Each structure stands twice: as structure tokens, then as C-alpha cells.
Amino acid sequence: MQSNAGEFVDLYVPRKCSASNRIIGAKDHASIPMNVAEVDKVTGRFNGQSKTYAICGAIRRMGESDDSILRLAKSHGIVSQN
Amino acid sequence: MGRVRTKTVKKAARVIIEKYYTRLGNDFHTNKRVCEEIAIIPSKKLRNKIAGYVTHLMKRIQRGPVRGISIKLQEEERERRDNYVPEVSALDQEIIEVDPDTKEMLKLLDFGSLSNLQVTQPTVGM
Amino acid sequence: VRMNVLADALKSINNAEKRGKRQVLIRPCSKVIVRFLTVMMKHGYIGEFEIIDDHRAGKIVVNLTGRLNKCGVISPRFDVQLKDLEKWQNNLLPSRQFGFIVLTTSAGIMDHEEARRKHTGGKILGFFF
Amino acid sequence: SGALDVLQMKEEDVLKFLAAGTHLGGTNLDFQMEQYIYKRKSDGIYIINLKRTWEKLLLAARAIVAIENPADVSVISSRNTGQRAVLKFAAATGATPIAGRFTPGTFTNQIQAAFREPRLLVVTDPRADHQPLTEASYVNLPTIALCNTDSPLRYVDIAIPCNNKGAHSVGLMWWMLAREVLRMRGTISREHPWEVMPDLYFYRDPEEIEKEEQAAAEKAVTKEE
Amino acid sequence: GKAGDKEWLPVTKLGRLVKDMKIKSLEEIYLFSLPIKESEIIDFFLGAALKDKVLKIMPVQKQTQAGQRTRFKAFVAIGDYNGHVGLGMKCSKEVATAIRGAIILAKLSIVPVRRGYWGNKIGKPHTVRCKVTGRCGSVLVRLIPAPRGTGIISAPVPKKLLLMAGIDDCYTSAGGCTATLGNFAKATFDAISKTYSYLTPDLWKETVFTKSPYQEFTDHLVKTHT
């Protein structure tokens, strides 16, 4: 957040979950980052740079996260036509 | 009557069988004298109890596995059941066929082999 | 009955956004709802929206994001005279800095920030933030 | 899938899926399990798609790879069928098994001596191991498990559908799971037969084991005679 | 005579990374929304700006066949004047032990606040970002933003918390039974929490999802550490 100078304030800028577009607080212990491993996709062997996600507790606790994690990987890979 | 064993007996009885499994017999008197040497039990009457329960446990340990304590040879046979069972080496019997409405899925996913057809009657409980 | 159409409309998109959705169905499609959502789209609280056509009155479908917190209606429709304005916007908005009271004027439907630059009072409809 | 046919399901594995009856799934359904099913028979039994099973296997396994420590991907199962399977899993691949009764508070205590902080979980059957799932949402653990048609989804991030009512469906699936993580991380890759098989991830069968061992001893004695 | 402390050997993973000093601020912790399970982590980062303000020391007591039995339940506030506050309750047989139990618990539950401006900028935020609420069982508060130099206009109870928060200007109003102050202060604390859980147009730009400290610093923790 900006000021007169454009100087940035706020002690931490919180992170905003992928499929809910809302922000998770300092205490919120049902919110998970989930690391998918990429592969080279020529031999199907692990190669470094991961795809990382974040999900909030609200969609987790109702049981909607399973669709969100699927759709996120469906707009990328690995998922073709499921 | 009464005389239901306390937890102080049942705690140490398990321990003494785990780490001195070999020394045990199944006689009262032999199992007493072993407990006297591998540990000190500060009373005499207490000693006569802990031996008798150690004896009573050792009867059951020579059958199937007890669920309160572990010994080595049971964890052997555990491993022997849990690395191969004699029932199969084949997956599952190598060829298993399926009925239609599964075949329609496979038709649209480029598979077209090893099937049977039976079109079983309507319906649930009917 | 369905006395006021716009008032029944906003509660759906309010309820839907809370549960976590991104497509809705709102009926029965008034022209008033269209120009409302047009202004609400420019600022960026909702995405593009598709008007289905029927002869009856139509149906509208919306694509939305979590940016919206709540859009409410204010009914019945009171007048504002550009000195009553400051009193309204204090009660109805979380902050001076952002939030947008909507209204209709003879110069068309618009936010309050625009109306002040045209010197036009008029009838208030709802709000959002 | 992703890569064109060097990750996509082979003709071989199809036989194993069908012989272990994984395709079959229970009578009752949930509204989160509607898409995974294709359809019903003429009888109460609903046929899980095997293509849809296969895609979910991969990113599940790829997440088990994505951690840089293999000693803190804590697997859990408490059903008897899922004891022998998980034990070989976490023995072969570096992982931590929690076999049998969970003994609650082991993801939130500072006094218990079985306290652990892992990152992932891999659970069999939500409705036997509901306890670790609830405690996962107090300390931010990603979660994976094996769902059936009638198993609800709640405090899980990804499902791996299966028949899993106590079958060869169980042990086969845990074997396949351990196969994939080695194709990406390990040097087992070649994707042509691995030495270890799914014939020891299957259930004990303790009374069936004792009877088979007795019959094998009788067959050994009669071969020697 | 004899010298040297030795205090705080971590049994917690997060605690060990702080003790080896590869986590450089609490602001990293909050960004991943981790629990904090030890009271020395916070007291390592801070500890020379944290004050306590014991609100009430309240008796409660039940009835048994031998008569009364009374335990003392005290509330204790905590906060430095840069944006971090907390609050805690605890009860025990005696007084001092309950107080010291609460001074530990309040450090554990500490959180940051988000401060903002009135309608214009001149640097250094002095008030609350947006108009928020917070309820605890029929008590609620309506923290309303205020211009500079008005001071905190509130009852005595929330005037403690908001002043420690560094929120120097605020208008408030209460609703319901504020006599039972345990509700009243927990409802204030509830409101003060919501400040970073309220979405504003500033935060609409998308996050970069930087990798976790748990992931990057895992190399030191492959010895026997848990």
C-alpha cells in the first residue's frame, strides 16, 4: 500500500489463494501450499522447477479443494482430457 | 478373593519378557530366580507375583502374537507374511474381461481387446 | 409478486460469492440491472457477463471474482442534492478512500464520484464496495 | 497425459486393474464422486473410469517427489488390509509409517514422544482414519488419500479413486504408487519390469498364511518323500 | 559466582530455525500462516518493547458437598507500540501462577495489525484501514476510522488494546452487555484481527507464491531433527 511518496507500508503483504481469491490471516492453520513437481516431459524424469499453489481453509473444510486442485492442473499440466 | 493384578506388575512383566525372552522357561520357580538376577524386586511377596504373571504371559506368547508387547521371532514371521503371500505372483490372473458400458468408455479411449458381453437385467433388487 | 426486481437480484450474487462460485443465474433481467452491472464492471469487481435472450424477459449469467465483498440495495429511492451526499456516503461505505454509491440522474446511471463533476443530484439506487 | 506416451497408461497395467477389480465401486455415491464414475451397470455397482484414476495417480505421486526430504511423508492406515501394504511402501521408499491405532495428539503436542511434523499425509480410507485428517487442519499439512464412491471428501486436497473395501485393490494401488515416485526420482526408471511385484503388498490372509505355510511344509515333506 | 544461561533448547522445528537464525522476522512466519507453539520464539525477536497490562483478576468458584472451591482467573494484555498485540486468559488455584500462565499464553497468541489513513496521505498510518466489527456472544464493537489527533474515543477496556496496537485515532461504539468484560475485550481483539483479513483494492494484484522456509531450510533438519 502506497503513501505520498509511494512508500510501501504494511508489515507483511499477505498471500492470496488461487481458487477463492481471498487472503489468509496470521492465524489460519487449515491453509496449505501444495507443491507439484514438474518433469522434463521427454523421459518423464523430475526436473527442478516446481508448480506451487495455495488453498484456503474454507474451501478445504467444505470439500471443494479437490475440484480446485484438479482445475488448476487442468489449465496447465499434468492433465489432458480427464 | 479379589487379588486383581495392578499396573506396576503388568508394566514390568512386559518389559522383563521383551529383553530376557530367552532366559524364560514355563515353570514358576525357574522364572522367579531369573527375575531375581536380571533385576532386583525390593520385596519378596512382590517377586512371587511378578514371576507368576511372567509365567502366565509366556504360555500365551507360544501361541499367536500378543498385542501388548513384541518379541523378535514374531516380527520375523510378520515380515515373512508382509513381503509375499503364496496366493498370487500373477496380476491378478492376467486376463479379466468386463461387461458393456465399460466397453463404451474403452471405445472412446482407444482400447478394443479382451472383453466379454453380458447385458444383465433391470434393476436394483428387482 | 416480486415488487422490486433489482433488490432480489443482488442478494443472489452476494450469497453466491460467499460460498465460492464464479457463475450464477439471475432473472428476470431488467435493463436497470444491466447498466448497474456495467458501472460495477469498469471499476473491476466482476468480469464479462452474458445476456441470454428469451421473449419472456431474458436471463443473465455473470462471471465474477472474489474482489467483491458485498453489493446491497437501498430501497425506497431517496433524493440527494449534493449536500445530503456526504451524510449518505459516510454511513454506507467502509472508508472515504474507496467504495462507490451508485445513483441515477438525468445524465444517466453512474457512480457518485462522476455525478459530483457534472453537478447532478438524483435518486439513489444501491451501493457496493 | 503430459508427455505424449512416456507417462500414459500402458496395455499391461490395464490387466492388473481389472484382475484386482479396482474398476468396480460401491452402491452409494457422493456429489464429489459423480465425475469420477462413468455409469452404473444393470445392477447396483458403479463403474469407476480407469483413465480418470490414472491422471490422479500422477500429480499425487509427483507431489510425493516434490519434497526434498524423504523421511517426512508420513503414511497412515489402520485397517488390517492396509497394514502390510503401507509397511512395504515406507520401507522401500523413504517415508514414515504409522500402522494401527493413531493415538491422537501426535501432530499437536510438545510432551508426547511420538510427536512429528511431516508435510504430506497419504491415508487409506477417510472413514477409518478420520482422526489424523482433523489434526492435519491444525498444522497446515497437505493431504492425499484413497477415496471410494461412498467415502466423502473433507480435509483432503486430492483423491486417488479405488474400490478399496478390502481386496487386492488395496495392495496393487500402493505398489503402483511406489513405482511412479521411483520413475521420476530413482534410477529404477526404464519403465520395463521392476523386480518387486504386487504379491506381497496384498493382505496377510494371518490364518491363510499359517494354512498356506502348513500346506507348503506338507508339499515340501511329500516332495522329499 | 556461577554464570551463563542455557535456556530454550527447541523441541519444535520452527523453533530450531530461529535458534540457528535462518528466519529473520516474524513476518515470514505469518505469511505462511504457521502456528507458533513456543513462547520464546516471539521473545527472541522482541522482549525489549513488550509491556503487559493486567486487566482484571476475577474469582470464579463451583459448589461441592464440602462447600466452595475458588480459582482465580485473570486476563493479561500484551503489546509493543509498533503493531503487534495479543491477549490471554488462564485460571489456576492461586493468583501469581495464573498471571504468569497468562503472560506466556498472550505472547503465544500475538498477531499483527494493519493500520491505514483517513482520506489522504502524509506518511505514517495513524488509524484503522477500514470500518470493521468483531463479535463475541452478544457484544460487538464497530471500529470506525478517524482523522489525526482526535485520540482514541472508546471505553476504558478497548482503550488499552488499541493504544498498544499503535492505533492512535479511532471512533467506536458498543452494543450489548459490556459489563462482562471477558466478552468485551475478546470482541475487540476479534475486530483487531480482521484488519489483514479484509480485502482492499490495494491487495488485488496477485501474489508470487514464494517458497516456504520449511522447504528451503530443510537441509539442516535432515540429521534427526523434528
XYZ file of N, CA and C in Angstrom, chain B residues 95-107 111 113-122, chain D residues 18-19 21 23-24 38-50:
126
model
N -5.729 -62.125 -17.172
C -6.754 -61.739 -18.112
C -8.037 -61.743 -17.329
N -8.737 -60.579 -17.292
C -10.062 -60.440 -16.731
C -10.783 -59.562 -17.715
N -12.027 -59.963 -18.073
C -12.875 -59.293 -19.027
C -14.006 -58.633 -18.281
N -14.693 -57.672 -18.952
C -15.678 -56.801 -18.347
C -16.860 -56.753 -19.275
N -18.026 -56.305 -18.745
C -19.302 -56.267 -19.430
C -19.503 -54.875 -19.992
N -20.419 -54.644 -20.955
C -20.617 -53.366 -21.629
C -21.011 -52.252 -20.703
N -20.809 -51.002 -21.189
C -20.932 -49.726 -20.512
C -19.613 -49.394 -19.874
N -18.704 -50.393 -19.809
C -17.305 -50.221 -19.532
C -16.618 -50.257 -20.868
N -17.112 -51.110 -21.800
C -16.610 -51.217 -23.152
C -16.787 -49.940 -23.932
N -17.843 -49.155 -23.623
C -18.134 -47.903 -24.281
C -17.146 -46.838 -23.888
N -16.680 -46.838 -22.616
C -15.608 -45.980 -22.157
C -14.306 -46.256 -22.856
N -13.983 -47.556 -23.025
C -12.766 -48.026 -23.631
C -12.728 -47.791 -25.117
N -13.909 -47.769 -25.775
C -14.101 -47.455 -27.172
C -13.682 -46.043 -27.493
N -9.104 -48.474 -27.002
C -8.865 -49.797 -26.492
C -9.995 -50.615 -27.056
N -9.855 -54.632 -27.026
C -9.447 -56.017 -26.922
C -9.942 -56.568 -25.612
N -9.979 -57.924 -25.499
C -10.106 -58.672 -24.262
C -11.343 -58.321 -23.467
N -12.530 -58.580 -24.058
C -13.798 -58.200 -23.486
C -14.744 -59.353 -23.658
N -15.842 -59.338 -22.865
C -16.966 -60.239 -22.980
C -18.184 -59.357 -22.975
N -19.366 -59.934 -23.300
C -20.603 -59.198 -23.315
C -21.626 -59.990 -22.561
N -22.250 -59.342 -21.548
C -23.478 -59.802 -20.957
C -24.176 -58.547 -20.515
N -25.514 -58.490 -20.707
C -26.281 -57.267 -20.691
C -27.354 -57.391 -19.637
N -26.942 -57.869 -18.434
C -27.719 -58.212 -17.254
C -28.952 -57.371 -16.988
N -30.040 -58.026 -16.501
C -31.385 -57.491 -16.483
C -31.510 -56.306 -15.547
N -32.353 -55.309 -15.830
C -33.003 -54.451 -14.842
C -33.533 -55.162 -13.612
N -7.957 -54.761 -13.747
C -9.205 -55.449 -13.965
C -9.206 -56.738 -13.202
N -8.018 -57.368 -13.045
C -7.863 -58.555 -12.237
C -8.009 -58.293 -10.762
N -10.016 -55.868 -9.664
C -11.370 -55.388 -9.506
C -11.473 -53.952 -9.055
N -11.908 -51.276 -10.859
C -12.891 -50.598 -11.673
C -14.246 -50.576 -11.016
N -14.636 -51.673 -10.323
C -15.857 -51.748 -9.553
C -15.819 -50.774 -8.396
N -18.296 -43.246 -14.420
C -18.865 -43.131 -15.737
C -20.337 -43.432 -15.651
N -20.712 -44.658 -15.194
C -22.099 -45.043 -15.166
C -22.283 -46.233 -14.266
N -23.529 -46.764 -14.254
C -23.978 -47.871 -13.454
C -24.075 -49.050 -14.384
N -24.186 -50.280 -13.826
C -24.484 -51.480 -14.569
C -25.993 -51.594 -14.675
N -26.538 -52.833 -14.759
C -27.958 -53.112 -14.693
C -28.310 -53.504 -13.281
N -27.310 -53.415 -12.382
C -27.335 -53.905 -11.038
C -26.652 -52.809 -10.283
N -26.807 -52.807 -8.939
C -26.165 -51.863 -8.060
C -24.703 -52.169 -7.992
N -23.906 -51.318 -8.674
C -22.470 -51.338 -8.730
C -22.208 -50.288 -9.776
N -21.222 -49.402 -9.521
C -20.982 -48.231 -10.325
C -19.545 -48.290 -10.720
N -19.283 -48.113 -12.033
C -18.030 -48.464 -12.644
C -17.221 -47.203 -12.776
N -16.182 -47.082 -11.912
C -15.157 -46.057 -11.904
C -14.421 -46.118 -13.226
N -14.080 -44.947 -13.822
C -13.252 -44.874 -15.007
C -11.811 -45.047 -14.599
N -10.998 -45.712 -15.451
C -9.638 -46.096 -15.129
C -8.696 -45.092 -15.714
